Amino acid sequence: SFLECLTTRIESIIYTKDNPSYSTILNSTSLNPRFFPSSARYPLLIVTPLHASHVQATVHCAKKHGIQIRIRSGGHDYEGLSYMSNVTFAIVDLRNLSSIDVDVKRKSAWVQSGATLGELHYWIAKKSQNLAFPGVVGHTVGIGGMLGAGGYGYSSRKYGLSADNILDAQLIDVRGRILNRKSMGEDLFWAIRGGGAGSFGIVLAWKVRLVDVPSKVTVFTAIRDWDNNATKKFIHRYQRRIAKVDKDLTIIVRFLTASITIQISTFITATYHGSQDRLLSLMEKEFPELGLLAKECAEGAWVQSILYFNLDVLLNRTLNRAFKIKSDYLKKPIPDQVLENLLVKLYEEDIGETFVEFFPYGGKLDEISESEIPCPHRAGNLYNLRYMVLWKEAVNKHLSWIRRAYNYMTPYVSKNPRGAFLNFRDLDIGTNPYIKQASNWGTKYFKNNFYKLIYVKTIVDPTNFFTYEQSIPSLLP
Amino acid sequence: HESFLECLTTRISESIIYTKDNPSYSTILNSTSLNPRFFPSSARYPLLIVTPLHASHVQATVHCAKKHGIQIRIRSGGHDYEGLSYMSNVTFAIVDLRNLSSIDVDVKRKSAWVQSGATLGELHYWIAKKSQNLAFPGVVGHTVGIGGMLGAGGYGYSSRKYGLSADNILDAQLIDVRGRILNRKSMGEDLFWAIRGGGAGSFGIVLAWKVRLVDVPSKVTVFTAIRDWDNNATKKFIHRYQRRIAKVDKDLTIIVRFLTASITDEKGSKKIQISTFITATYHGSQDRLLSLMEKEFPELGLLAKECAEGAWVQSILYFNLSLDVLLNRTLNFEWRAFKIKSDYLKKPIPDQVLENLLVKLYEEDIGETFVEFFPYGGKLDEISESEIPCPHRAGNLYNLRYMVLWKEGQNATAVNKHLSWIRRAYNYMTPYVSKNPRGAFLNFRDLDIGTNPNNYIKQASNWGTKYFKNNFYKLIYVKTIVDPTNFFTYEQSIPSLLPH
Ligand SMILES: *Cc1cc2c(cc1C)nc1c(=O)[nH]c(=O)nc-1n2C[C@H](O)[C@H](O)[C@H](O)COP(=O)(O)OP(=O)(O)OC[C@H]1O[C@@H](n2cnc3c(N)ncnc32)[C@H](O)[C@@H]1O
Ligand SMILES: *Cc1cc2c(cc1C)nc1c(=O)[nH]c(=O)nc-1n2C[C@H](O)[C@H](O)[C@H](O)COP(=O)(O)OP(=O)(O)OC[C@H]1O[C@@H](n2cnc3c(N)ncnc32)[C@H](O)[C@@H]1O
Ligand SMILES: *[C@@H]1O[C@H](CO)[C@@H](O)[C@H](O)[C@H]1NC(C)=O
Ligand SMILES: *[C@@H]1O[C@H](CO)[C@@H](O)[C@H](O)[C@H]1NC(C)=O
Numbered sequence A: 001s002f003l004e005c006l007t008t009r010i011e012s013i014i015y016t017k018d019n020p021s022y023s024t025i026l027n028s029t030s031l032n033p034r035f036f037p038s039s040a041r042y043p044l045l046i047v048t049p050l051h052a053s054h055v056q057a058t059v060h061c062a063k064k065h066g067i068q069i070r071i072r073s074g075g076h077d078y079e080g081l082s083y084m085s086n087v088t089f090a091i092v093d094l095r096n097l098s099s100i101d102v103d104v105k106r107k108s109a110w111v112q113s114g115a116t117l118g119e120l121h122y123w124i125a126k127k128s129q130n131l132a133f134p135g136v137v138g139h140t141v142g143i144g145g146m147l148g149a150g151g152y153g154y155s156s157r158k159y160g161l162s163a164d165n166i167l168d169a170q171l172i173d174v175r176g177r178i179l180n181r182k183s184m185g186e187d188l189f190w191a192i193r194g195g196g197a198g199s200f201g202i203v204l205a206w207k208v209r210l211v212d213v214p215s216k217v218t219v220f221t222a223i224r225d226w227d228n229n230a231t232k233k234f235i236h237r238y239q240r241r242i243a244k245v246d247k248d249l250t251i252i253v254r255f256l257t258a259s260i261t262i263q264i265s266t267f268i269t270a271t272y273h274g275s276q277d278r279l280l281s282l283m284e285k286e287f288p289e290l291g292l293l294a295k296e297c298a299e300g301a302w303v304q305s306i307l308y309f310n311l312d313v314l315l316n317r318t319l320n321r322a323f324k325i326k327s328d329y330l331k332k333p334i335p336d337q338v339l340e341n342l343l344v345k346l347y348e349e350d351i352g353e354t355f356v357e358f359f360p361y362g363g364k365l366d367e368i369s370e371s372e373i374p375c376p377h378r379a380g381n382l383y384n385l386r387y388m389v390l391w392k393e394a395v396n397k398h399l400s401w402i403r404r405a406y407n408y409m410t411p412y413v414s415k416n417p418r419g420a421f422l423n424f425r426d427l428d429i430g431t432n433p434y435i436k437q438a439s440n441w442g443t444k445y446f447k448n449n450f451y452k453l454i455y456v457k458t459i460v461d462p463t464n465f466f467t468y469e470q471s472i473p474s475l476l477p
Numbered sequence B: 001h002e003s004f005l006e007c008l009t010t011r012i013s014e015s016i017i018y019t020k021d022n023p024s025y026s027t028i029l030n031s032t033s034l035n036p037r038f039f040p041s042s043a044r045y046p047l048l049i050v051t052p053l054h055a056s057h058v059q060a061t062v063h064c065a066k067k068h069g070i071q072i073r074i075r076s077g078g079h080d081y082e083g084l085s086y087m088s089n090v091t092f093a094i095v096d097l098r099n100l101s102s103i104d105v106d107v108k109r110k111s112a113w114v115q116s117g118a119t120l121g122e123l124h125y126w127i128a129k130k131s132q133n134l135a136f137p138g139v140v141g142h143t144v145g146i147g148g149m150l151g152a153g154g155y156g157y158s159s160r161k162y163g164l165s166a167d168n169i170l171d172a173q174l175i176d177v178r179g180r181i182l183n184r185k186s187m188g189e190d191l192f193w194a195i196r197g198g199g200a201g202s203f204g205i206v207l208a209w210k211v212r213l214v215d216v217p218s219k220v221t222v223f224t225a226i227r228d229w230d231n232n233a234t235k236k237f238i239h240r241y242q243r244r245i246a247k248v249d250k251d252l253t254i255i256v257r258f259l260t261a262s263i264t265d266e267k268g269s270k271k272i273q274i275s276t277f278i279t280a281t282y283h284g285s286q287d288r289l290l291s292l293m294e295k296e297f298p299e300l301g302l303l304a305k306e307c308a309e310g311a312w313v314q315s316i317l318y319f320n321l322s323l324d325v326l327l328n329r330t331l332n333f334e335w336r337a338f339k340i341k342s343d344y345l346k347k348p349i350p351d352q353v354l355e356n357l358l359v360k361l362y363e364e365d366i367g368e369t370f371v372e373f374f375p376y377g378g379k380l381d382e383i384s385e386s387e388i389p390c391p392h393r394a395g396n397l398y399n400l401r402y403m404v405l406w407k408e409g410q411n412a413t414a415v416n417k418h419l420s421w422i423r424r425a426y427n428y429m430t431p432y433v434s435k436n437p438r439g440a441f442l443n444f445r446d447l448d449i450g451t452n453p454n455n456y457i458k459q460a461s462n463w464g465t466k467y468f469k470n471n472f473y474k475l476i477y478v479k480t481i482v483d484p485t486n487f488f489t490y491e492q493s494i495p496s497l498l499p500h
Helices: A002-009 A022-028 A052-064 A117-125 A143-149 A186-192 A234-241 A276-286 A302-308 A336-348 A395-412 A435-445 A449-460 B002-011 B025-031 B055-067 B120-128 B146-151 B189-195 B233-244 B286-296 B312-318 B351-363 B413-432 B456-467 B471-482
Strands: A014-016 A045-047 A068-072 A089-093 A100-103 A108-112 A166-172 A178-180 A202-209 A217-225 A249-258 A263-272 A297-300 A322-330 A354-360 A383-391 B017-019 B048-050 B071-075 B092-096 B103-106 B111-115 B169-175 B205-212 B220-228 B252-264 B270-282 B307-310 B337-345 B369-375 B398-406
Touching: A002 A014, A002 A045, A002 A052, A014 A022, A022 A045, A052 A068, A052 A089, A052 A166, A052 A202, A068 A143, A100 A117, A108 A117, A117 A143, A117 A302, A143 A202, A166 A186, A186 A449, A217 A276, A217 A302, A234 A249, A249 A276, A249 A336, A263 A276, A263 A336, A276 A297, A297 A302, A322 A395, A336 A354, A336 A395, A354 A395, A383 A395, A435 A449, A449 B471, B002 B017, B002 B048, B002 B055, B017 B025, B025 B048, B055 B071, B055 B092, B055 B169, B055 B205, B071 B146, B103 B120, B111 B120, B120 B146, B120 B312, B146 B205, B169 B189, B189 B471, B220 B233, B220 B286, B220 B312, B233 B252, B233 B270, B233 B351, B233 B369, B252 B286, B252 B351, B270 B286, B270 B351, B286 B307, B307 B312, B337 B413, B351 B369, B351 B413, B398 B413, B456 B471
Parallel strands: A045 A089, A068 A089, B048 B092, B071 B092
Antiparallel strands: A014 A045, A100 A108, A108 A202, A166 A178, A166 A202, A217 A263, A217 A297, A249 A263, A249 A354, A322 A383, A354 A383, B017 B048, B103 B111, B111 B205, B169 B205, B220 B270, B220 B307, B252 B270, B252 B369, B337 B398, B369 B398
């Protein structure tokens, strides 16, 4: 019944299950093969709007006919919420809403939200080698959900999250009225930058800040074997020191198991905004134990750092293992024996199919108030630990391993609330069935911003049309 | 009004009800009416004043005022900058907690139970009678009641070492709108969080606080350095202070005061210049303070003869006053009407801008006008904005305070002039301070920031976000749980989500 409403309002943009190009659309950005066997990943329909009129028509029809909407930019949702539901749903995919307009003179760019971050980086790089928008590591990440949840990458300690560099946005309201930052008010504008944007509206474009980047950016990857080297108690120094090391430098740690003769390997990877000479000087000054040899570094343009962590046009292809992620915030460093007890669990799974990662939260992330955007994890956070398990299509063993490791780490991590990064979506922390129960997941994502979030939600979508597993609830039923 | 007094006398059956008949009504009302700007006002007169001695009196008062439409203004010390604890635009009665001042100090468990009508001086005295190595960091004014002080945040010379006074609260006792006496466990952690640093008067009546005790070294060093801002480029030390005081050693708190003081020209005449009182407390010996100052601030030229080392309590005496039983007297420096404003600095004030702000001190009488810097470094970085309702934690360089004072002589052209001075200084500083929201410290109450009507939440957010950046929203939630009918209401009280 619903599809008649759409076509009557405003073609060949409606992809029903019968339509011969249906499945290829659906799989293309359902990017978590853990959810492939699910029986909730088949929507009634998929709209790929080209203009805001299509978005308004879709919202109008889906509200008036009991259909749920699954907003999609890139499909990188760790829990795959953007392409599945337990209710009759339809995907509004912003694939073909992706225009990018770069303003070198004003240091800003209007990027339509269905564009990937690799595209934004590429189109900034062909205009300047000294402007950039700092983002996540994965270059296939859609801009829409990325800026909706906020964004952490190798450059966040210098410039903050991606949501800390947003100037304006354009959005489709539950009423279907097109509104930018100026006409929407700054409570809702506050919401969309780092709150659950799918629970506030469908965001079609963002005017985003561009930031200076030196013409020399240096990356490095240092592989060191955790098994026995007492020399790598730099990790011990790293935990208690990396959040206050010079903010141009972000070192990310990855823990996995790899065969050498099965032992535990440590991948120390980093970006530094400056020349290799100065990077070597700084890190030898602070962490002379890592032994970062100059042959382990790479200077270049910023875009080459982007390439390193992913013919100088390689960022425009979105063609590239099932997995689950958990995240945790450390406000005091993990005691050593506890850390080794956590790491030995890596052998409980197949070689290199499980990761434990440290993401540092220093520099500019201290400077920014917990209320600046919905993301509250600013000051006192040493880093964001990521638990990771991988496999292909019993699955319960992988999930049991991840949940066990998390629960072992329980007494040593953030407590009230137990922090959780929104980009690392994790349905275990809580779901919606009212506000008391939903606060369980809300306060973990947003410490006290969750309450402002509910207030804005009740004003903005009182009927709770924009609802999903982790949508901000409304006070009015 | 009649039903109310019959209810009070009937409910819990002595001389704790002070009606207008009672010859000591005026003295009780005046005793903690501590802002002489409000002396000529016609709203500072309650129907009656209750001086509870037990929680039963407070419960009875809440019950009767609920059933007869009477408003309650909780008062502990009366230091409210806007005098809200002794004023209202409606028929109100004061619950004066003066005789709720019992103190139980526990050296071994490092905690103390303070009845809210005790002043901070009394609490300091009773800790000093037990150990010289325990302390409670508080506001500078020792006549400040514990109740309203802990209701708001509380800032002192040790907040950079220990956080706010509200950051060291372990337990509380409370009278809710239902008259139920409640501790931390029975009140819940949403309400327990609320009362610590939110508009605690807007949630209930807090009768006592169990507060954390903190260790202090056996030698604490104060200093006062007089420096001339007018011409001495050395005392452009300020430029460095702004950019360094938030990361200097947290055992150190240096507060600066800018005022106008008469000088003599050396040509015969009296000239008016800007004097700077650079004062500090350091938790440690005088030697370590002097060396620390040479490393961090060689510009003060801080000669040791400007310091005074001693026991911890001696700093309280130094910053209030000789025979050290003087903390049980709740009368202090000589009465002067005043108005205060505040702002939070996230980027250092540009030098010419600070100089132009300071020139405004010359517009008023000599030394009746102040601009002060309270630095926000140290442990105030460590504590999350959501830990208690106070949100001004990390990234704040300091808290600028504007202050203007005067005496009883009014022609109301002078009184209008002083307020215009304070507002002009504020509005000039606007583009250079915290913006959206414009921060404001709750202990420095300022009705100009915005008030409640006499949309609901839209308008209340105006002042709320400045006092409480985003915690204000959580605050309203707990209020709807705790006092949905908004019985505990005043000029800047958290509103309720339910309509009336
Ligand atoms: C897959 C992946 C993800 C990732 C990463 C690396 C890879 C390979 N590295 C990250 C990193 O270093 N740091 C970080 O903080 N996150 C990282 N991620 C996660 C990624 O940032 C997030 O998944 C991202 O926020 C989602 O982007 P994407 O747009 O691709 O994902 P989605 O499923 O389509 O959407 C996510 C949620 O937002 C809602 N949504 C989507 N588009 C919109 C628009 N336009 N308006 C409103 N809401 C929108 C979806 O409904 C879903 O809930
Ligand atoms: C007068 C003064 C104030 C002051 C100061 C020095 C002086 C001489 N120095 C301060 C400083 O260095 N740092 C700082 O942060 N504040 C400083 N102040 C301000 C002072 O702390 C506050 O004005 C404080 O509110 C005063 O406390 P007091 O106990 O005097 O409170 P009040 O005037 O009677 O009432 C004001 C508000 O508090 C509520 N209240 C009072 N008692 C209770 C109880 N028991 N329960 C709940 N609420 C209570 C009143 O209802 C009113 O809202
Ligand atoms: C109370 O304050 C008034 C100010 O209006 C003052 O004149 C009077 O002296 C005070 N009360 C007493 C008993 O002195
Ligand atoms: C009473 O109302 C007036 C409004 O004219 C306001 O200025 C004042 O602050 C209110 N409160 C008191 C205690 O007078």
